Amino acid sequence: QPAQTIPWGIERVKAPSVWSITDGSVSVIQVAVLDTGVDYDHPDLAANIAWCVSTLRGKVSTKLRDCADQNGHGTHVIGTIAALNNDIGVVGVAPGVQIYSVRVLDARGSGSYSDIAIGIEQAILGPDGVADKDGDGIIAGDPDDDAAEVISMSLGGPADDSYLYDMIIQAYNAGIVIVAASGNEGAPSPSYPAAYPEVIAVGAIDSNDNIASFSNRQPEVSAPGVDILSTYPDDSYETLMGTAMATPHVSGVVALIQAAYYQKYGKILPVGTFDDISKNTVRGILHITADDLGPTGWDADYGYGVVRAALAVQAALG
């Protein structure tokens, strides 16, 4: 195992200075990562893997075997959010956050919309299988429930299907922040589900603060997505690019925001909207604390700009 390094992306989104306040280890907070599965015993990840489930072929399985990563993408994404802060490997944006690994993509890195939709339902239901156990309407942020607070989707397709959107809406109404990759075709707008209003579309920047040429345009925010070093199977590390790599940076930020807010107030922030520029919503905070690159204001390349954990947490607690 190599000595721990802090990847440039984690530095860029200003995560390290937040860890004194929180590293995301607030017990009510989980981040659900709907991806190719996870190297569940990776030494730099294991302690944060709270649930390992699969929805492939429409069958919900917790067999560690069916939930393990046979591609690597999932493992990499998860490491960007939640790699442990220790003596080895790398470190995530939120190095103590609990992860739900929801395997909705197969070894090829492809997935059925149906499997993804089932995946979103599992993120809401949690291990107990019930969305709202005590029937109070509170799901995300209710300590009596085991719903995720963030749903992270480093994947996308061109179809807009009503059932998948209906599930997205269910997540949003459960108070869950949904984050998704904008896509890698250099297209004028994001793929689905990133293009839904209830989801945060994420574009990718490189280490020179330029937008990646492949990054789908008109995202909400942007984050590091070129030359991104993270965990990879088996118990190893690898460097990859994509809007799939940018997305977990954002999810990590959101995890920090909700953890820090819950630590201080015993509640989480509302999700908010694309237009929000206030301090009273996660997305509002994301937008007003982002590093505004390119032309002043929101723009087609960077969205509102590059997410900044340190500033977003300050805004949340102030």
């Binding site: 991806d35 190719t36 072929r57 429409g58 069958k59 919900v60 591609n71 993408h73 993509l105 890195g109 492809s110 997935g111 059925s112 919309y113 149906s114 993804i116 939709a117 089932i118 339902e121 809401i124 239901l125 969305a131 480093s154 994947l155 996308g156 397709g157 179809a159 299907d161 009503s162 059932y163 209906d166 599930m167 269910q170 990759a181 896509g183 890698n184 994509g242 809007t243 799939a244 997305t247």
Partner: protein, 66 residues
């Protein structure tokens, strides 16, 4: 021969035992939205479409890692 589709249903007219009648079977019943994933013969799409408890039938699309 078989295809997987996702059917949005009218819960007032749906019972999962209705699927067998058109040659299909249920893969997954959603708990949070009124929909079911079903496997059906490919030439049975039109027939499904015309069923009273069917509000929409959608093919199962593909997403890819980014």
């Amino acid at each position: 021969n078989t295809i997987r589709v996702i059917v949005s249903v009218d819960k007032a007219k749906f019972n999962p035992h209705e699927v067998l009648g058109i040659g299909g079977h249920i893969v997954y019943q959603f708990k949070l939205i009124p929909a079911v994933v079903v496997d059906v013969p490919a030439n049975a799409v039109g027939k499904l479409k015309k069923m009273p408890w069917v509000e929409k039938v959608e093919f199962d699309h593909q997403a890819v890692l980014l």
